[PDB]
Amino acid sequence: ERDLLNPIYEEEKQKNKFKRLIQAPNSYFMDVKCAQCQNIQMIFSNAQSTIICEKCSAILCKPTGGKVQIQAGCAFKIKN
Amino acid sequence: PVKRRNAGRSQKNRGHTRTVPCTNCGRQVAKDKAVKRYTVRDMVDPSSKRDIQQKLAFENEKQGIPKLYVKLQYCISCAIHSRVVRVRCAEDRRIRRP
Amino acid sequence: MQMKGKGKGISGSALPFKRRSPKWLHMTPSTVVDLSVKLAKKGLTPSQIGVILRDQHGIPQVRFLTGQKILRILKKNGCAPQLPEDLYFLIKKALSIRKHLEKNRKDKDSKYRLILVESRIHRLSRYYKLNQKLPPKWKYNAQTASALVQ
Amino acid sequence: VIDEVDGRNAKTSFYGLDITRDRLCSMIRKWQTLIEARVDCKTNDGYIIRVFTLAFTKKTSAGKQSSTSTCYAKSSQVRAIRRKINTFITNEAAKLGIAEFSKNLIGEDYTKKIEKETKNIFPLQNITIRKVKVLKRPKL
RNA sequence: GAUUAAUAGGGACAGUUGGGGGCAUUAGUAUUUAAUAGUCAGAGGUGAAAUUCUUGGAUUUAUUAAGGACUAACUAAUGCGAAAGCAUUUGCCAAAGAUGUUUUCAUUAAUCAAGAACGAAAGUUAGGGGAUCAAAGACGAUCAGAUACCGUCGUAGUCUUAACUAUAAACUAUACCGACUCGGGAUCGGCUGGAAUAAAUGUCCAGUCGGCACCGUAUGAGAAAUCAAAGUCUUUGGGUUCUGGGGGAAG
Ligand SMILES: [Mg+2]
Ligand SMILES: [Mg+2]
Ligand SMILES: [Mg+2]
Ligand SMILES: [Mg+2]
Ligand SMILES: [Mg+2]
Ligand SMILES: [Mg+2]
Ligand SMILES: [Mg+2]
Ligand SMILES: [Mg+2]
Ligand SMILES: [Mg+2]
Ligand SMILES: [Mg+2]
Ligand SMILES: [Mg+2]
Ligand SMILES: [Mg+2]
Ligand SMILES: [Mg+2]
Ligand SMILES: [Mg+2]
Ligand SMILES: [Mg+2]
Ligand SMILES: [Mg+2]
Ligand SMILES: [Mg+2]
Ligand SMILES: [Zn+2]
Ligand SMILES: [Zn+2]
């Protein structure tokens, strides 16, 4: 027995992006702080490209299917 | 009516599978279907090895006679007749590895 | 799932609920409109421009922030990409196929694939022409394609 | 190959290196992957070789390879190893004497080296240099 | 003054996956056949033998070469391709799914007479190529009979280029698109969390999309075999294409 209108948070957290009721994504946004310049740039959780630090020109993120690996030790807050 | 689900073979995705010649009749049989039983054969019979061990020669790493490697491929037609796989009863037809 | 009696799935993308613009961000519609048209001037697809504004400058959904869809913004600012991504690209690969086919005049799987791709293009023309979004005398044959190559 | 004779004695140089059915058929299970790398090496000796390598994927979960255990390695990973293995050996030969190379090929030296580069792509087992043929040996 | 953005559809993009395809290239044994040596009377083939081959040397052993096809073992209810079909290496050429998306476009779509693209074999035309097997044929044997099931040989083909042919138990004999409804693990591809080692294009735990497939079961279906769909049809109606109407004569 389960209510379909007041579903558990966990359950919906497991389900597939499009299966959840209100239906929302997983992607998020993050302020990255270069390993040098320090500049704080916003990068999308699913960047589809390599990202440079507009200050110096360092490498911050490498693209993948879904996740974006962050180059070396750079900082990252999840804006939400 | 229908007798089997796999009709004897395992072709599940593709439309065609390589054909292979029968170890016994020489007949052509689709790989997937034909019976197989790659066995580890021994060079000499039981009591007969001991006779070759004493009159043996070369070193003795305790590795004895190389065992024969026989990759066996039978087509249904003769596979049966050859005591390999006997006509099994109704519900036992779905049993795999008894 | 288009030209496919057998293959079919779900790529992704589901716009979040909250119809307003993200908190953290501050940018009068105009601010973006500049980036958008600037970026566009460099020669960009509204398809690609939006990608930047998401990956680079944290703007998830330009439409949600401006109250304007990219292509529209662009068209209002003269920076309109003549022929739509849709058609453009299909015709691009449609062409790439033809070139490859030449030196491989025997590659049958490719003859087929092109047949499908050329088929699509006729489907877009039918469409884009009906929305008076492309001159009626438009015709992709081989000259329409090579015409864009120049 | 008998390369020279010193009265009543047959002198011989290197010609070929190989293995046998015991070993070959030996390491061959039906739930792993089989890899092979062919290579044309160049020795400073004025000697040309062809070396065949034999690779097998290794489990890592205690589950004795069953119909339930799969130790396959995406074909992309396979060639990934070939590319790496062969490339290692062509350099190995360019820096040795046939006397050294043969000595090394028979030794578990290369089994260890390949094992090193490979665990990076996919942990292997029973690695071997299946066969070696003297393609063209100058007689300077 | 321009509805959302369809767990509809088209494009962009991102790592990745595949025995998908086209050009190149590249091996590997084996079958033949040839050289170089080596002996010695039998080889080969069958239930038995027989035509067959052989001291102008067979079968045989070692090295090597030529040649045409073929891709073993790993290769499994596993993978890709619209289907037919597709497995040596490496390199190019254009292509594809799935996954990932807080990217665009916003009905663009489902199926389809006409009308086209493909479509193993076998077969056909004109050239190549010709190793193996081999329709027709020539022979042995078997039979009361054997131009048949075994055996010895052998032409077309089988391989290829360029044309043409379109059928096959072209089979899941089960049209495509869509929504639902039982349980369960294991798979192949992608992704996201985590743990151990270790810091591995690896392993495992847990999710989850998408893909073959299986196991259990139905107060659901059937003539039954059986079917997770062959189900949600007398409680008879999601959309669309094709087909049948006793049998034989007959495709
Ligand atoms: Mg078929
Ligand atoms: Mg769907
Ligand atoms: Mg596994
Ligand atoms: Mg290829
Ligand atoms: Mg013979
Ligand atoms: Mg040869
Ligand atoms: Mg596979
Ligand atoms: Mg192979
Ligand atoms: Mg035709
Ligand atoms: Mg001819
Ligand atoms: Mg008689
Ligand atoms: Mg013959
Ligand atoms: Mg992970
Ligand atoms: Mg899992
Ligand atoms: Mg009925
Ligand atoms: Mg069932
Ligand atoms: Mg009805
Ligand atoms: Zn910096
Ligand atoms: Zn048989």
Swiss-Prot record, chain D:
UniProt GO MF annotations: structural constituent of ribosome
Q: Name one GO biological process term.
A: translation
Give GO cellular component annotations, separated by semicolons: cytosolic small ribosomal subunit
**Source superkingdom:** Eukaryota
Q: What is the protein's name according to its record?
A: Small ribosomal subunit protein eS1
Where in the cell?
A: Cytoplasm
Annotated family: Belongs to the eukaryotic ribosomal protein eS1 family.
**Parent-record interval covered:** 90 to 229 of 265
Q: Does the keyword Transmembrane helix apply?
A: no
Q: What disulfide bonds does the UniProt entry report for this chain?
A: none
Tell me, in one coarse class, where this protein mainly resides.
cytoplasm
Q: How does it assemble?
A: Component of the small ribosomal subunit. Mature ribosomes consist of a small (40S) and a large (60S) subunit. The 40S subunit contains about 33 different proteins and 1 molecule of RNA (18S). The 60S subunit contains about 49 different proteins and 3 molecules of RNA (25S, 5.8S and 5S).
Q: Which UniProt keywords apply?
A: Cytoplasm, Ribonucleoprotein, Ribosomal protein
